[PDB]
């Protein structure tokens, strides 16, 4: 009954990477 | 080693969620996003709006408004902002404002109150500029609170009270309206050329009472125009208007078999066209919820006056278009209305032949579940035009989410010349 404003917390990522924790993290 | 001096245009995602609530007829900030000069900004909001559960079924729909504005930092700080950017790295930090100690003392600004009690002033000052230029009545004075902590609990928690939808009583003629204008003729003589000059000066005064109370209105009458930087006003980007509807739920047990409960649930969209940001500043979004102003004990003017003369009833064009505005009392429009000086205002000479009021039967009076103004709007002219949310408490069931609540997703995409995270963390 409500797709966009109930699924996810932000928009789609089309740009540079933001987070670097030292490797893969899942 | 390697010093970086420029950056490519990158797509930055500023999307976030919003959980919003408020009262009827109060302006409240729902989203904001600081911007940099040279950016390319675009916004799209999708969500659902709800009211508190009703005591009865659906009777009257509500009206919802969404607004978006852009305010440069130069409008907030002025010359201080100019010296800030010219100095560079060693510039003086910008001034701040003081806030309260509770968690909800800045809810009208769309943010949680920090525990330090100190915040930048560009959100508070931008809110005042928007309200004084677009939402208050042109004839009432400006709001000039220096700090958020100077507001009362109601204003900081929910926002400033706005004006009702335009009616005969909620949109009266401005208080500086004259019904007479005197001249200084001689004891037994009169100058008739001076009489012509008197009418010319009266016409310019009436123009500034009805049409031109702001500087940009005076320039517009000459045929010119002013930029938003000339009078230091916010720039409107987009406005959206829609009505909220829902459905009904039926009770099925022994006691409630035959009664109904209405719930309002409406999806909406608020799309803003692509905007080129010329200077550093902020972009804010606000919401407003109102009901049509229906009053239970309101009747026709001809019914309330009782004794009718030729001027009242004939509707003769010569008399209608050549007489000064008439002053009437609240008694002539509402049951138990007043007659004193604070219950008096001025209207057009034959306004009652251009509109017809709504009728509410006496069976609906003092009945919970119907959004109505029980009786009449009280107070002076200032209190009569502004909406009071406590009068709608009889329509909703008590809840922690106020009188309306919403949940929206703001899709924000901006093209920004900023270095990547990898560039920022690697020395070489």
């Amino acid at each position: 009954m409500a797709k966009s404003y109930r699924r996810g917390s932000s928009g789609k990522k089309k740009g540079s990477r933001l987070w670097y924790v030292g490797g893969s993290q899942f | 080693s390697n010093v970086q001096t420029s950056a490519q245009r990158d797509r930055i995602d500023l999307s976030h969620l919003g959980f919003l609530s408020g009262q009827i007829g109060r302006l409240k900030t729902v989203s904001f996003s600081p911007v940099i000069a040279g950016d390319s900004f675009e916004l799209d909001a999708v969500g659902a709006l709800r009211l508190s559960p009703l005591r009865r079924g659906l009777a009257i729909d509500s009206n919802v408004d969404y607004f978006t504005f852009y305010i440069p930092y130069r409008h907030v700080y002025g010359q201080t902002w100019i010296d800030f950017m010219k100095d560079g790295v060693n510039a003086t930090p910008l001034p701040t404002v003081t806030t309260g100690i509770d968690m909800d003392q800045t809810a009208y600004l769309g943010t949680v109150n920090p525990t330090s009690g100190i915040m930048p002033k560009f959100l508070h000052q931008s809110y005042l500029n928007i309200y004084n230029n677009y939402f208050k009545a042109p004839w009432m004075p400006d709001r000039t609170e220096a700090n958020p902590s100077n507001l009362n609990d109601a204003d900081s928690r929910y926002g400033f009270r706005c004006c009702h939808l335009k009616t005969i009583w909620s949109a009266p003629l401005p208080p500086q309206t004259e019904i007479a204008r005197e001249m200084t003729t001689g004891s037994t003589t009169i100058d008739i050329m001076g009489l012509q000059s008197a009418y010319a000066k009266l016409h310019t005064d009436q123009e500034r009472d009805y049409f031109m109370q702001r500087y940009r209105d005076v320039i517009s009458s000459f045929g010119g125009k002013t930029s938003y930087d000339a009078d230091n006003r916010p720039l409107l980007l987009m406005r959206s208007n829609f009505w909220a509807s829902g459905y009904d739920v039926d009770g099925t047990d022994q006691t409630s078999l035959g009664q109904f409960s209405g719930r309002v649930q409406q999806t909406f969209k608020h799309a803003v066209p692509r905007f080129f940001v010329p200077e550093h500043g902020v972009i804010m979004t606000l919401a407003l919820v109102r009901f049509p102003p229906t009053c239970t004990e309101e009747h026709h003017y001809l019914i309330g006056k009782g004794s009718l003369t030729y001027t009242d009833l004939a509707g003769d064009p010569t008399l209608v278009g050549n007489l000064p505005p008439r002053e009437i009392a609240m008694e002539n429009l509402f049951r138990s209305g007043g007659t004193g000086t604070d219950q008096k205002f001025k209207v057009a000479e034959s306004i009652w032949y251009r509109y017809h009021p709504s009728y509410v039967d006496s069976a609906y009076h003092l009945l919970e579940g119907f959004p109505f103004l029980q009786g009449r709007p009280a107070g002076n002219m200032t209190e009569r035009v502004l909406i009071d949310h406590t009068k709608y408490d009889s329509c909703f069931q008590s809840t922690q989410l106020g009188q309306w609540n919403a949940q929206a997703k703001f899709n924000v995409s901006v093209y920004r010349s900023i270095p990547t995270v990898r560039d920022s963390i690697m020395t070489s």
């Binding site: - | 928690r157 008590s398 809840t399 922690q400």
Partner: protein, 177 residues
């Protein structure tokens, strides 16, 4: 059969230790047995000594101002008893003050409460709706249970009293859910 998962006066999960004290009933300065604390409370007494006087005594809580809502429900459960008959009756009380009070203000509002009273034992599990917004700005509202008598009898009392404010609700295990 099925369980009744519906009750009045959900009780706090922790109780104060049993204590003993002596009080004197008053009409305009009714004493408070314990320091008021936020929302719910439950206390028990081993020996509560009451002198011969006229007036009342009260056990008071402080109303939570968060979750702005004027009308809220308050509940009570108490099994007060003793060795003799002290000729008293009970009701709910509402009053407000600008500071933390040790007594009850001369002006207050009473709300009827229906319980049981055989000889000197009082048992009740009732609830009522009371307004929470203060009448004068800058004050805090206080709600509690007051025992009143036009002529008290000297003696000692023992029992347990519990007060709750319904600002939130408690969940429990339902095996069929």
């Amino acid at each position: 059969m099925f369980q009744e998962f519906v009750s009045k006066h959900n009780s706090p999960f922790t109780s104060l230790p049993m204590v003993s004290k002596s009080v004197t009933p008053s009409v305009t300065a009714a004493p408070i047995l314990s320091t008021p604390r936020n929302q719910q409370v439950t206390e028990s007494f081993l020996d509560l000594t009451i002198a011969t006087a006229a007036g009342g005594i009260a056990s008071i809580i402080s109303v939570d101002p968060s979750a702005k809502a004027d009308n809220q429900v308050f509940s009570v459960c108490a099994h007060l008893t003793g060795a003799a008959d002290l000729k008293y009756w009970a009701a709910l009380v509402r009053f407000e003050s600008a500071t933390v009070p040790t007594t009850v203000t001369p002006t207050f509002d009473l709300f009827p409460i229906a319980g049981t009273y055989s000889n000197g034992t009082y048992i009740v599990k009732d609830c009522a709706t009371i307004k929470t917004f203060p009448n004068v700005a800058g004050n805090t509202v206080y709600v509690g249970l007051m025992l009143f008598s036009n002529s008290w009898v000297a003696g000692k009392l023992t029992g347990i009293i519990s007060i709750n404010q319904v600002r939130t609700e408690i969940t429990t295990l339902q095996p069929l859910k």
